[PDB]
Write a protein that binds this ligand. Structure first.
Ligand code: UHN
Ligand code: UHN
Ligand code: CA
Ligand code: CA
Ligand code: CL
Ligand code: CL
Lengths: 9, 228, 228, 9
């Protein structure tokens, strides 16, 4: 199950 | 970072991202928040990207160590080291939650900023819940739920169903339901309803907004495919 | 790490590698070295892997920042941040060089350990040389050269031409010649002679040793393909 | 030009 990766602007 | 200009901290956070120095990036953005001014959209994203990378590395390490520790339970070093990483992870989550409470959330009056920060609050309580054991877990879980729920209530009143923050909030709250709250049916219902309402609003969007929204819709669909 | 058992530091260094926590890994191995006992083959590799990962991340960040700084020279923030990363990188190199000097090298009497540590000494002076500017660069370059040369002299007298440490030493010394010393012809000659002498000794090896040696020989060939 | 990667035990 995946959340928003959120690791690149 | 009290002696560095706000604008220099922001510029260095962007450089640190390019250099993949995410601990530095988070420290620069923490310093920028502590200047006391509200953050722009771009600056909020820099803050979130910095901490998501830092805590993402910690969560991945915690999972590796926890897996080794569990297999070992089928000397004290694996548990001791898992505890060290866990404490560091909790400290980063507490730092982010502290910035949100002092004073990002209370000064956020526009829906876009307030939903963004409440989604962050839900996420970092969720990361605390991933490592919590016992009744501590119950109150931490409720704190995540309450933050996500307030964000959802605002987002449904104030943002279109295709708004990327609204979509990412719903995605992460659905993951909360599935992975933390043991509510897979609520996770599936939220992901489905979110996807369907966004689909019906795509016709209103420009080419660029369409790309932004459909990217996150695919993430909702990816989870639905795994869950059903 | 003075209060932690040597064996616990080694075990935690292995866990930290699995968790991709290389700063922790380096700190655990530094603590193990500072116990004062000599290191086994496996322990030497853990020390080297830990620091190569730490300094490898720093070198990659330094290169990103240096590239941005140079393009900017075609406010002070890019230079200031490049300097911060550079100082951190120099500190890690100094830490490794300090462990080698106090007292890993002087206690290393077998060829395998002494060549290993002198190759490390050449490598960390080489990383210092990558960021050095001026006449400081000259003495740092000579320190790298001298360490690699002593390692080469021992390796040619005491190890077969297929020994993986001998091969990796020759590979890295050839990179030193090409990238640091502005001696591409010496780099090419060393890589060629090393490859050819190893090829002629492969017939003496087991299947597993053959795999170990040919892997590094391919790296020599990859460089020769780029350089010629 | 590549040195020994040296980043995995
Ligand atoms: C929770 C959340 C956070 C940010 C967003 S976003 O601003 O619409 N956006 C951030 C950049 C991402 N891109 C960058 C490179 C790949 C993806 C896309 C999402 C939405 C939700
Ligand atoms: C400079 C140097 C260092 C180590 C060696 S090695 O011990 O023969 N070896 C380390 C492990 C490497 N493997 C691990 C996974 C991929 C490669 C291979 C080299 C030689 C030279
Ligand atoms: Ca100011
Ligand atoms: Ca002891
Ligand atoms: Cl406000
Ligand atoms: Cl000895």
């Amino acid at each position: 199950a995946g959340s928003i990766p959120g690791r690149r602007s | 970072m009290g002696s560095m200009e706000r604008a220099s901290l922001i510029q260095k956070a962007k450089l640190a991202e390019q250099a993949e120095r995410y601990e530095d990036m988070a420290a620069f953005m923490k310093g920028a928040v502590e200047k006391g001014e509200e953050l722009s959209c771009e600056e909020r994203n820099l803050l979130s990207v910095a901490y998501k990378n830092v805590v993402g590395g910690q969560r991945a390490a915690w999972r590796v160590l926890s897996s080794i520790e569990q297999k070992s339970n089928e000397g004290p070093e694996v548990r001791e080291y898992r505890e060290k990483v866990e404490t560091e992870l909790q400290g980063v989550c507490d730092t982010v939650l502290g910035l949100l409470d002092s004073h990002l959330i209370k000064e956020a009056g526009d829906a876009e900023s307030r939903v963004f920060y409440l989604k962050m609050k839900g996420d970092y309580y969720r990361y605390l819940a991933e490592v919590a054991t016992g009744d501590d877990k119950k109150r931490i879980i409720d704190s995540a739920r309450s933050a996500y729920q307030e964000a959802m209530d605002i987002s449904k009143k104030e943002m279109p169903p295709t708004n990327p923050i609204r979509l990412g909030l719903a995605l992460n709250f659905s993951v909360f339901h599935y992975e933390i709250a043991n509510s897979p049916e609520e996770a599936i219902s939220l992901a489905k309803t979110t996807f369907d309402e966004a689909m019906a609003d795509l016709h209103t969007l420009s080419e660029d907004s369409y790309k932004d929204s459909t990217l996150i819709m695919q993430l909702l669909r990816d989870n639905l495919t795994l869950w059903t």
